[PDB]
């Protein structure tokens, strides 16, 4: 119906930077959106804690069915194939992003912990101790902040089309 009246009234405040291309599709459970994302904090430093369009490689988010983190999908329902928006979300919906950011790169290996334990998708002849434990994101578990994402959207599939290989 209204995604930018709702996203105002959630606690939430939106901002798109260039509108994209194409029609606005479901966005419910199983939607396989395919974006860049860049989590900086907004005013207590401006440093960047996470960034993937810097290095030109794209992040996966599945709506409401193997992802664990809703502020992503809320952020993504009101952006179309080719949109770019940038902006704030309050730290009840971002309270378990440092959780999440524990998984979207490790489980997203291939299917869950113990069922893919393999590099066997695009990860090949690199020898380096890779070591969990950061700082950047640990900064919200001592003093929690509302953070910036800048998301990009290329393209976004329905339940029906989608399918991994």
């Not at 695009?122 to 953070?147: F, T």
């Amino acid at each position: 119906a209204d995604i930018i009246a709702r996203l105002r009234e959630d606690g939430i405040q939106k901002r798109v930077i260039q509108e994209g291309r194409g029609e606005l599709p479901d966005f419910q459970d199983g939607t396989k959106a395919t974006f860049h994302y860049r989590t900086l904090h907004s005013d207590d430093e401006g440093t960047v804690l996470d960034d993937s369009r810097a290095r030109g490689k794209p992040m996966e988010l599945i709506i409401g069915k193997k992802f664990k983190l809703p502020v992503w999908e809320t952020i993504v329902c009101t952006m179309r194939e080719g949109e770019i928006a940038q902006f704030l979300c309050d730290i009840k919906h971002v309270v378990l992003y440092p959780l999440v950011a524990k998984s979207l790169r490790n489980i997203a290996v291939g299917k869950d912990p113990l069922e893919g334990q393999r590099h066997c998708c695009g990860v090949a002849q690199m020898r380096e101790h890779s070591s969990l434990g950061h700082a950047d994101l640990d900064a919200l578990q001592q003093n929690p902040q509302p953070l910036i994402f800048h998301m990009e959207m290329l393209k976004v599939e329905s339940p029906g089309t989608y399918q991994q290989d």
